[PDB]
Amino acid sequence: DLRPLVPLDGGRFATSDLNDLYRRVINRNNRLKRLLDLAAPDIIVRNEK
Protein backbone atom coordinates (compact mmCIF):
# COMPACT_ATOMS: atom_id res chain seq x y z
CA ASP A 1 0.00 0.00 0.00
CA LEU A 2 2.93 2.37 -0.37
CA ARG A 3 3.06 1.58 -4.09
CA PRO A 4 -0.58 0.92 -4.84
CA LEU A 5 -2.40 -0.29 -7.91
CA VAL A 6 -5.54 1.85 -7.55
CA PRO A 7 -8.53 1.01 -9.75
CA LEU A 8 -9.17 4.10 -11.78
CA ASP A 9 -12.53 4.66 -13.40
CA GLY A 10 -12.74 2.74 -16.66
CA GLY A 11 -10.66 -0.34 -15.93
CA ARG A 12 -7.52 1.73 -16.37
CA PHE A 13 -5.30 1.26 -13.33
CA ALA A 14 -2.89 3.95 -12.17
CA THR A 15 -0.06 2.16 -10.44
CA SER A 16 3.10 3.48 -8.89
CA ASP A 17 6.47 2.62 -10.39
CA LEU A 18 7.94 0.38 -7.71
CA ASN A 19 5.55 -2.30 -8.88
CA ASP A 20 7.30 -2.06 -12.23
CA LEU A 21 10.80 -2.20 -10.78
CA TYR A 22 10.08 -5.10 -8.44
CA ARG A 23 8.41 -6.90 -11.31
CA ARG A 24 11.63 -6.52 -13.26
CA VAL A 25 13.79 -7.74 -10.38
CA ILE A 26 11.57 -10.71 -9.60
CA ASN A 27 11.62 -11.65 -13.29
CA ARG A 28 15.39 -11.52 -13.42
CA ASN A 29 15.85 -13.45 -10.19
CA ASN A 30 13.52 -16.21 -11.35
CA ARG A 31 15.23 -16.25 -14.73
CA LEU A 32 18.64 -16.59 -13.10
CA LYS A 33 17.41 -19.48 -10.98
CA ARG A 34 16.03 -21.09 -14.14
CA LEU A 35 19.37 -20.63 -15.90
CA LEU A 36 21.17 -22.23 -12.97
CA ASP A 37 18.96 -25.31 -13.06
CA LEU A 38 19.93 -25.85 -16.71
CA ALA A 39 23.57 -24.82 -16.10
CA ALA A 40 23.86 -22.67 -19.19
CA PRO A 41 27.28 -21.70 -20.57
CA ASP A 42 29.02 -19.01 -18.60
CA ILE A 43 28.25 -16.17 -21.00
CA ILE A 44 24.55 -16.72 -20.29
CA VAL A 45 24.79 -16.77 -16.50
CA ARG A 46 27.22 -13.87 -16.54
CA ASN A 47 24.92 -11.69 -18.59
CA GLU A 48 22.04 -12.70 -16.37
CA LYS A 49 23.84 -11.77 -13.16
Binding site: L2, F13, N19, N27, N30
Partner: protein, 85 residues
Protein backbone atom coordinates in the same frame (compact mmCIF):
# COMPACT_ATOMS: atom_id res chain seq x y z
CA UNK B 1 4.86 5.34 22.04
CA UNK B 2 7.29 7.95 23.40
CA UNK B 3 10.10 5.77 22.18
CA UNK B 4 13.65 7.24 22.14
CA UNK B 5 16.36 8.31 19.84
CA UNK B 6 16.00 6.67 16.45
CA UNK B 7 18.78 4.31 15.36
CA UNK B 8 20.19 3.32 11.99
CA UNK B 9 22.64 0.64 10.88
CA UNK B 10 23.24 -1.95 8.21
CA UNK B 11 20.43 -4.29 7.21
CA UNK B 12 21.58 -7.71 8.34
CA UNK B 13 20.06 -10.51 6.25
CA UNK B 14 18.41 -12.53 9.02
CA UNK B 15 17.07 -9.20 10.21
CA UNK B 16 15.60 -8.78 6.75
CA UNK B 17 13.93 -12.13 7.22
CA UNK B 18 12.55 -11.09 10.61
CA UNK B 19 11.00 -8.14 8.82
CA UNK B 20 9.45 -10.54 6.34
CA UNK B 21 6.00 -11.99 5.97
CA UNK B 22 6.79 -14.60 3.35
CA UNK B 23 8.94 -14.62 0.24
CA UNK B 24 7.61 -12.90 -2.85
CA UNK B 25 8.16 -15.31 -5.71
CA UNK B 26 6.21 -14.34 -8.80
CA UNK B 27 5.85 -11.15 -10.85
CA UNK B 28 2.04 -11.16 -11.01
CA UNK B 29 0.15 -8.37 -9.31
CA UNK B 30 -3.60 -8.82 -9.91
CA UNK B 31 -5.83 -11.22 -11.77
CA UNK B 32 -7.18 -9.27 -14.83
CA UNK B 33 -10.70 -10.74 -14.39
CA UNK B 34 -11.40 -10.55 -10.67
CA UNK B 35 -9.29 -7.76 -9.33
CA UNK B 36 -8.22 -9.70 -6.29
CA UNK B 37 -4.45 -10.12 -5.97
CA UNK B 38 -2.69 -13.17 -7.41
CA UNK B 39 -0.69 -15.20 -4.90
CA UNK B 40 2.04 -14.50 -4.53
CA UNK B 41 3.40 -11.55 -6.51
CA UNK B 42 4.36 -8.01 -5.55
CA UNK B 43 0.95 -8.07 -3.99
CA UNK B 44 -0.55 -10.90 -2.03
CA UNK B 45 -3.01 -11.75 0.65
CA UNK B 46 -1.12 -14.27 2.74
CA UNK B 47 2.12 -12.29 2.66
CA UNK B 48 1.03 -8.72 3.20
CA UNK B 49 -2.34 -9.24 4.84
CA UNK B 50 -5.99 -9.15 3.88
CA UNK B 51 -7.61 -6.89 1.32
CA UNK B 52 -10.88 -6.08 3.08
CA UNK B 53 -10.92 -5.50 6.82
CA UNK B 54 -11.49 -8.76 8.65
CA UNK B 55 -12.29 -10.74 5.53
CA UNK B 56 -10.38 -13.68 4.08
CA UNK B 57 -9.35 -13.89 0.44
CA UNK B 58 -11.49 -16.86 -0.57
CA UNK B 59 -14.03 -15.72 2.01
CA UNK B 60 -14.28 -18.54 4.53
CA UNK B 61 -13.91 -16.35 7.64
CA UNK B 62 -15.71 -12.99 7.81
CA UNK B 63 -16.30 -11.99 11.43
CA UNK B 64 -14.46 -9.95 14.03
CA UNK B 65 -14.33 -12.95 16.35
CA UNK B 66 -12.27 -14.85 13.81
CA UNK B 67 -9.45 -12.30 13.85
CA UNK B 68 -6.09 -14.03 13.97
CA UNK B 69 -7.03 -17.36 12.45
CA UNK B 70 -5.35 -17.92 9.10
CA UNK B 71 -7.76 -19.49 6.63
CA UNK B 72 -6.78 -23.06 5.85
CA UNK B 73 -7.62 -22.55 2.17
CA UNK B 74 -5.54 -19.47 1.32
CA UNK B 75 -3.58 -18.83 4.54
CA UNK B 76 -4.59 -15.18 4.76
CA UNK B 77 -4.31 -13.91 8.31
CA UNK B 78 -7.72 -12.30 8.78
CA UNK B 79 -6.83 -8.96 10.37
CA UNK B 80 -7.26 -5.26 9.66
CA UNK B 81 -6.46 -3.91 6.24
CA UNK B 82 -4.03 -1.32 7.55
CA UNK B 83 -1.79 -4.30 8.28
CA UNK B 84 -1.49 -4.30 4.49
CA UNK B 85 0.59 -1.15 5.05
Amino acid sequence: EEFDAIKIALASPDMIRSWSFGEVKKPETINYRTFKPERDGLFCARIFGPVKDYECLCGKYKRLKHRGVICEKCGVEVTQTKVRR
